[PDB]
Design a protein around this ligand. Structure first.
Ligand SMILES: [Mg+2]
Ligand SMILES: [Mg+2]
Ligand SMILES: [Mg+2]
Ligand SMILES: [Mg+2]
Ligand SMILES: [Mg+2]
Ligand SMILES: [Mg+2]
Ligand SMILES: [Mg+2]
Ligand SMILES: [Mg+2]
Ligand SMILES: [Mg+2]
Ligand SMILES: [Mg+2]
Ligand SMILES: [Mg+2]
Ligand SMILES: [Mg+2]
Ligand SMILES: [Mg+2]
Ligand SMILES: [Mg+2]
Ligand SMILES: [Mg+2]
Ligand SMILES: [Mg+2]
Ligand SMILES: [Mg+2]
Ligand SMILES: [Mg+2]
Ligand SMILES: [Mg+2]
Lengths: 125, 55, 141, 179
RNA sequence: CGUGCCUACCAUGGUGACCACGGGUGACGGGGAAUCAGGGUUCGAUUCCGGAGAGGGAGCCUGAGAAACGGCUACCACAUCCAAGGAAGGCAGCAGGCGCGCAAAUUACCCACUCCCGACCCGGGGAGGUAGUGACGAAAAAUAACAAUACAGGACUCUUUCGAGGCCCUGUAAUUGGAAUGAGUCCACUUUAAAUCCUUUAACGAGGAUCCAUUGGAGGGCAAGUCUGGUGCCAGCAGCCGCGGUAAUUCCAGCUCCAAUAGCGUAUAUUAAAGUUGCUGCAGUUAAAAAGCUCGUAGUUGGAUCUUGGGAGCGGCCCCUUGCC
């Protein structure tokens, strides 16, 4: 049904990564999701799906092509190393657990006021 | 000098008339279409001594 | 008649910079007395407070009793004879209300029917006088 | 501070004399002839023709053997040919000035639909180009103010749509009413 | 570091009618912005560069770099807690509050992008980026559209046709559909640091109670009524000319039109028109304007005269004056 083709293709052997521009054509239904595009690209590259990422998607005003940037690696350790934590957050490899405003800054001020043992008492709890 | 009691005399003593149920008007491109087809398709039997956009 | 040499441009700019003041528009635009003499401080609009309601007379060929409002300003603190625009609005302007005022058609001259009124009421107590003349936006009190 | 974009171009010129009876009749017959919405998109075409005339008079001011004149004139003639106003014949600069307002309205989208079928009454062709039912190429066109280039000039289509593309937009209402 | 930057002595110099000096600026300077012949005119606080200030001005440690202010010291004006003996302050940073006003937004999220800083691949950043208000302004852009049936108001090809209509707008509060498509209602996507919107898509989703286009005008300038009813120099309209005093082409309303159109009126500053600031490009007998006359400084302007015809080679160099040796 869908047709996935890479237009531009580069290889950076310094990180063992392969960058590509991916166009997924749709003469039919809606935008095929992240997981399904990832699985089809993993089947077309004939490796494990947990090493290939993709980011960004467009739509050319009525069916048409959807354009993104795909990253094929060769190691899950290299994926943990050379990728940001928010692009690991699509699969949940990193969790921050404090996505809150003013908590860090109020702990900064409560450490800025007192010093030493009282600072370790107040700022760490 | 003059009296200040006569304010809005004509607006008060004018008898009110209810606005009738006018049908809706085609607007925009449709309005320019009817403006073209009102004064550019069937005007040529008339003569220049008289003009009738309102009477 | 003129001065038409190659080194006469200082004489030209001197004569032109002198004779440019005799135009009325240039001197009323670039002389400070037309800012420190007029009201509004050289602005577009001004708020004010109703002091009294005056029935002024019209000119010689037109016999009418125009309705004006004497307005104490807030910005400068002057007194301005404003003007009630429409057929009514004398009953819509009460005593000591916030009144926005503007010009008629020109800063200097006035309208040829009212003798000494340069200014016009636009709002009455933060609700527009067009709404007070129409049906919508009835007055608070 | 912020740095994103700041630009302001007006393809919109209100004329000086507001109410001329001959000019208002000319603009009304132009709208009724080429199927337009309002007079600002007549003033668009008038301003673009005026700007092309400004460029043409600026080129004709220059000396004939000037390389900037030759480059800019050849580029302007190439752009006018690829639009489709001029021909592959007269490549002079006075032939640019010898034009009319109606040529760009002819080279707009729906007038090419009038010249190449599936139009059916330009006031309905407005609807046919607004609703996705006339498709110059695989990139779908949704815009009435579309200058059709002469290099393709023939691609009029529609895919995955109502009359031939396929689908039940509101005939399922009629089928559920009968059933 | 060179400097009258400062001191001692000596000389009397320095600037100016080509406008110094002294005032005013509702004056931060530029790149630029608006205004369409050309020439000009008016703004530029504002996102890029440079200068100045952190309530006023004075002084200073540290430091390579500060007379620093999200550093310190003292005075003045405010102003906080005070058990009254003392501490403590600077939003012309980001929000927000009062006041001033004609006049100008939320105590939002994130360091994901851009970069910056530090011992440093890891931390921080109201610098920034995203979202909320937003009709300052700019670009695209539906508003009931649309093709058909029929009454024909009839225009038009042609035959005495009082019509044969493979062509035409129009009222049809008359029908038929494509049941066109959009706005909204919402599933799933996608965007994204996490989200929102556009975009993709499933399902609802118009037939006049519809899902409703306003803003101004209709005497001339300037498009549109010598329509109807009241008002009868009263109310008022009208930026000017003017209308209204019983038959209102201008008031109020109704109907119908017209102007532009999801941007219209209004006020103000400004530009063009304004050849009504004139260098291009204005005038000076009478319309506003040539000093009573003359001399004369500064300024402005200032007669002619000193390189000439031609040669080589056709369909650019020199001589008969043409780089000095
Ligand atoms: Mg006036
Ligand atoms: Mg001395
Ligand atoms: Mg210009
Ligand atoms: Mg110019
Ligand atoms: Mg400097
Ligand atoms: Mg400083
Ligand atoms: Mg302050
Ligand atoms: Mg600072
Ligand atoms: Mg501060
Ligand atoms: Mg009126
Ligand atoms: Mg009327
Ligand atoms: Mg007229
Ligand atoms: Mg007016
Ligand atoms: Mg004159
Ligand atoms: Mg006389
Ligand atoms: Mg005289
Ligand atoms: Mg004389
Ligand atoms: Mg002399
Ligand atoms: Mg001479």
């Amino acid at each position: 049904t869908v047709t996935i083709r890479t237009r531009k293709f580069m290889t950076n052997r310094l990180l063992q990564r392969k960058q590509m521009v991916i166009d997924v054509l749709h003469p039919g239904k809606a935008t095929v999701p992240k997981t399904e595009i990832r699985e089809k690209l993993a089947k077309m590259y004939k490796t494990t799906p947990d090493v290939i990422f993709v980011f960004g998607f467009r739509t050319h005003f009525g069916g048409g092509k959807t354009t993104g940037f795909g990253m094929i690696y060769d190691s899950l350790d290299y994926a943990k190393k050379n990728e940001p934590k928010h692009r690991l957050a699509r699969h949940g490899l990193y969790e921050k657990k404090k996505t809150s405003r003013k908590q860090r800054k109020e702990r900064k001020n409560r450490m800025k006021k007192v010093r030493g043992t009282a600072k370790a008492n107040v700022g760490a709890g | 000098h003059g009296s200040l009691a006569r304010a809005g005399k004509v607006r008060g003593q004018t008898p009110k008339v209810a606005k009738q149920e006018k049908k809706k008007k085609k607007t925009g491109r449709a309005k320019r279409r009817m403006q073209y087809n009102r004064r550019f398709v069937n005007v040529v039997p008339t003569f220049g001594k008289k003009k009738g956009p309102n009477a | 008649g003129k001065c038409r040499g190659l080194r006469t441009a200082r004489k030209l700019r001197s004569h032109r910079r002198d004779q440019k003041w005799h135009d009325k528009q240039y001197k009323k635009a670039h002389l400070g007395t037309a800012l420190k003499a007029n009201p509004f401080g050289g602005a577009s609009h001004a708020k004010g407070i109703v002091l009294e309601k005056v029935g002024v007379e019209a000119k010689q060929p037109n016999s009418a009793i125009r309705k004006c409002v004497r307005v104490q300003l807030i910005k400068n603190g002057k007194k301005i004879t404003a003007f009630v625009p429409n057929d009514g609005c004398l009953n819509f302007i009460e005593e000591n209300d916030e009144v926005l005022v503007a010009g008629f058609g020109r800063k200097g001259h006035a309208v040829g029917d009212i003798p000494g009124v340069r200014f016009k009421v636009v709002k009455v107590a933060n609700v527009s006088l067009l709404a007070l003349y129409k049906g919508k936006k009835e007055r608070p009190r | 501070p912020v740095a994103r974009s700041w630009v302001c171009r007006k393809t919109y010129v209100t004329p000086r004399r507001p109410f001329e009876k001959s000019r208002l009749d000319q603009e009304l017959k132009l709208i009724g002839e080429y199927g337009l919405r309002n007079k600002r998109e007549v003033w668009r075409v008038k301003f673009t023709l005026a700007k092309i005339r400004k460029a043409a008079r600026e080129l004709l001011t220059l000396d004939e053997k000037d390389p900037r004149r030759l480059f800019e004139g050849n580029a302007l003639l190439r752009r006018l040919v690829r639009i489709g106003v001029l021909d592959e014949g007269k490549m002079k600069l006075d032939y640019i000035l010898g034009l009319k307002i109606e040529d760009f309205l002819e080279r707009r989208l729906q007038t090419q639909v009038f010249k190449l079928g599936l139009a059916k009454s330009i006031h309905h062709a407005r609807v046919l180009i607004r609703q996705r039912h006339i498709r110059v190429r695989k990139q779908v066109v949704n815009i009435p103010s579309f200058i059709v280039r002469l290099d393709s000039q023939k691609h009029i289509d529609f895919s995955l749509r109502s009359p031939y593309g396929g689908g039940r937009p509101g005939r399922v209402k009629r089928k559920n009413a009968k059933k």
